[PDB]
Nucleic acid binder design. Sequence first.
RNA 1: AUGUCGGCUCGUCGCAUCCUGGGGCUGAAGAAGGUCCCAAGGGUUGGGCUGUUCGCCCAUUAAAGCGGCACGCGAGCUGGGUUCAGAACGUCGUGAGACAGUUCGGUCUCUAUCCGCCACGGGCGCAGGAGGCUUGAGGGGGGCUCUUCCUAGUACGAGAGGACCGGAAGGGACGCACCUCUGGUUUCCCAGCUGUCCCUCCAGGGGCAUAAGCUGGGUAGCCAUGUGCGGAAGGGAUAACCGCUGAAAGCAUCUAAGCGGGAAGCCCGCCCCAAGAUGAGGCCUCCCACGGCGUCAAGCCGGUAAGGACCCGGGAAGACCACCCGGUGGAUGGGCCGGGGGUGUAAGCGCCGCGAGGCGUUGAGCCGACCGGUCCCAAUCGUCCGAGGUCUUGACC
RNA 2: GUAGCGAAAUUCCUUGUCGGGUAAGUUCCGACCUGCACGAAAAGCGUAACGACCGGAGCGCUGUCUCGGCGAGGGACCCGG
Lengths: 206, 122, 117, 117, 57
Amino acid sequence: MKGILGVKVGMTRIFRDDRAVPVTVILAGPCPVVQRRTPEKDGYTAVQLGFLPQNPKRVNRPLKGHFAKAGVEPVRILREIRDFNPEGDTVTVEIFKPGERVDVTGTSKGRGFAGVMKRWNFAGGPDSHGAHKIHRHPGSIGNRKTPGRVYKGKKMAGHYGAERVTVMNLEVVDVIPEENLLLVKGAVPGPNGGLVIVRETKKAAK
Amino acid sequence: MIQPQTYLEVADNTGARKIMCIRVLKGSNAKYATVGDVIVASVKEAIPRGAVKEGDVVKAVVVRTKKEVKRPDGSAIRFDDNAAVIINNQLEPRGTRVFGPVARELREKGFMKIVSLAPEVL
Amino acid sequence: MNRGALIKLVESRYVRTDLPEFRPGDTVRVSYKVKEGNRTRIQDFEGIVIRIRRNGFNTTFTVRKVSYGVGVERIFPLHSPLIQKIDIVQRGRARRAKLYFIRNLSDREIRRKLRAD
Amino acid sequence: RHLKSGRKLNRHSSHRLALYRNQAKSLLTHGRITTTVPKAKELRGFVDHLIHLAKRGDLHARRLVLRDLQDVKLVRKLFDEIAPRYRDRQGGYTRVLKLAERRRGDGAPLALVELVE
Amino acid sequence: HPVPKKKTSKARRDARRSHHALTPPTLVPCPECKAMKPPHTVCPECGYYAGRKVLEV
RNA sequence: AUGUCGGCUCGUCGCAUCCUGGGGCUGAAGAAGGUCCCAAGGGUUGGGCUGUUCGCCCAUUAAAGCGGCACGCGAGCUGGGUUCAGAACGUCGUGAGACAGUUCGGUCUCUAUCCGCCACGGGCGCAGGAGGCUUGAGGGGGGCUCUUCCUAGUACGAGAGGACCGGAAGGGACGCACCUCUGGUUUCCCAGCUGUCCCUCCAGGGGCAUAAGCUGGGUAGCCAUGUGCGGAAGGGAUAACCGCUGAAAGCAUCUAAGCGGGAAGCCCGCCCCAAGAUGAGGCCUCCCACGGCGUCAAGCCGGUAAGGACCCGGGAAGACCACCCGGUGGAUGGGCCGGGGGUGUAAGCGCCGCGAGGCGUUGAGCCGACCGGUCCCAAUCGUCCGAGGUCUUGACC
RNA sequence: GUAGCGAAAUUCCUUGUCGGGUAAGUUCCGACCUGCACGAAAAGCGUAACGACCGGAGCGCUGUCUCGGCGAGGGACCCGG
């Protein structure tokens, strides 16, 4: 139930009759650089690692912190919980049989200090009936002397793009082992050329 | 496809080829309307004689001038907004209508009758 | 390499050649013929006769609206690759200026002017 | 909200074009220009284009650089003095070097453009 | 209008001013002459990266 | 000087619940109820009238809650009302005027120091120096629901009518994300057109006609009106209620013995932040115990690319800084090249037509970011801080 | 208190009743008289033309809104004075 990988695109396909809409995530086949066994940690968990960026461009602390079990020369070295790794190197020729289910998370597209009209989806002042401050500004945010404080958690202008985001249950319309491509009928967060890790959940009777 | 308050062609029996859509009718909260959704609606114009004066009658929207994206995956759209008037359950008062033949509307299942009924030319 | 390449792997698989029918134009009075199943699995064989009005490219295409005043106008984008389609026949020449979106039609329509184009 | 794109550039549309064509005249005359850095960056884009058409070599393309710079003495000056100096090389006809001394009273970093020789 | 309500101190004022301050500019020997030079722009005198392209008049 | 009704925008809270759940009782057959009890997690729409909260009134719906919160919220809005000056009607007054009697009018100043809030940093601590990867105390997000259909119109029924339980299938609202599709933008990407002035006279161009002249298109991007998911399943402890055993009341009794079931509620589960959690770091790798100066080598030092920073090239990261990837043992910008993808046949020449134009060379030309290639152009050469960020006790050689 | 007007730039009780409008009218229109406290030069009652008057419908068009999106400029942010 795993695979670290670089989201590539969002591109339609047709299906028998109805048409489906996969994104096309590559999954090259990372070298599990470190088991986290469990005597040593609570997790029991893999630390693997995808694409490879030239040998010299490297602090030697990774040269050997990567050398021990030894894969080769790469950077997207991230960790995930609960997955024995019989293989010396995962690949998804059979990590994922097509048509199962999958749970994807990858970093979201940025925004910079996007405003309140964004943030909480609603907002606005009415326009053109008077506004010293037209349309899109946050409304009042409290109440006099109930506390004299903004209630601590509440909505406000902020920064809404650099966040990690997941998308849970969604269909894997098809693996394709050759170029280690994978097709996941849906959205999948990210830029593209971007980064994503992939795992599982789906128990419910629905 | 959208219509909260609107005008809308009609041409069964009907007082016109025009009616007012009051509030649409599904799921309590509502907002919009696809074909096959019932839409209760007033009848802004009355054909002389005829059988629908100036009241309001429930009726199913057909066509929509809005790009509905099909499951077979393609999308009919036509420069018109035209309901058919309906009675009680889901029927037709008049048996005549002017619209293209075609489907989806039957896939709604509620009214296989209209799709049976709606001809060809125009 | 990269995403253009691999998506052309993936579409070489499905979207494939759309089965080679690659003759756009725009004047093109034309017959597309979609399947559309429905009642009793019946793959009734719908056949539409219409005026191409636009098309949009990029591997996946969409013959864009293909229009026809049945009496009311009805327009029909009709995904060019998809297997839904079966047979296609241009009946017009690929002539007449301005590429696509010819909205001359969507508004002032009328047999007479279209013939004037 | 803007995230991806390009051409991220200051002044004002029309007079942006005017700015470029203007400095382009300058550089294609004197052979080097000293300016604030961003102006230099975009200038190398645009001018590198114009010299490309300069080696493109014919009547049309000549009248297309005329579609820009609009000044026939500088046009032919370019068009026979320059092209041989690049009648081999592919792109990157320009050069840009940041200069030691930020300017008085306005504080811009400066820069030094000249097409390569 | 929504005016400040008071001074608060040499301290907190100097806190703000404190956190301002500024960096020394970078500088390197010139490969050629020497001097300082911002680490790579063509210096005013020894005057190049390679091939002079300045000066003399 | 404590800006007063009402609306917007944002709210959060309680329960004396409108619905959703869970249960007693019935003058409950079933279904629909009635009525009280436990229940605050979510939800409580769209309009007409009026300044209106209020109220009736249409359309429904699971419902269309009641209240707080300076009759929440004007250093955030509107100002319709009402409390200014102008004006008029009614009436009261001999008169100026007046009336919780109406009527039309009638400047809303609001650069933030502090708390609070949202994001983002700076120093620094974490008693060897740095480079990565994470658990999670803890905290937040989320928690909705209807409709048809199956067991079956079966139990119930004397028919019409019609279920519990338990399993699916569909949407509506809302939540989070994504460009493929549909769609919207695309201020200069393409073409057309009008005046005019100037390039050179005609042809072809340019500027100005809003900061795109105007009209048709439009990639990327950014987006909704589009697509995908999500609301749980499970488990624990539970409230009304239902018990099992069971005494003191040698029978009986759900009780302090002692155990059990029992909900959208609580906890965990799912997402997300988070060790400045001073109690993390925990793991891993290399640096080392570099060698330094009057030894408590916790000072001064190049050391130490171990690393790091400065500068640079940039960036679907972005105000700034941060983050991330590159520095010539490069493919990171810019360009050239190839595809894409926009427009929709370039000028030139020829020929046709009195002439506006047509036709052929012509799906041509031009081409912004799109996908790759290509050391042509630049990221040259570079200095700068950098070790004890750990101790006494306990094993242990 | 005559003719003329009346739920009225006058009527409180009040959204007075009836009818017209709208799916729905505390608004306006036409009547009713129950003129609290209209009325004849502080003028009554009409009236074509006219209004930067005030009220009420209807259409045409639209970001006023249903919910908003996007793009340019000018400020805002960063640097220097």
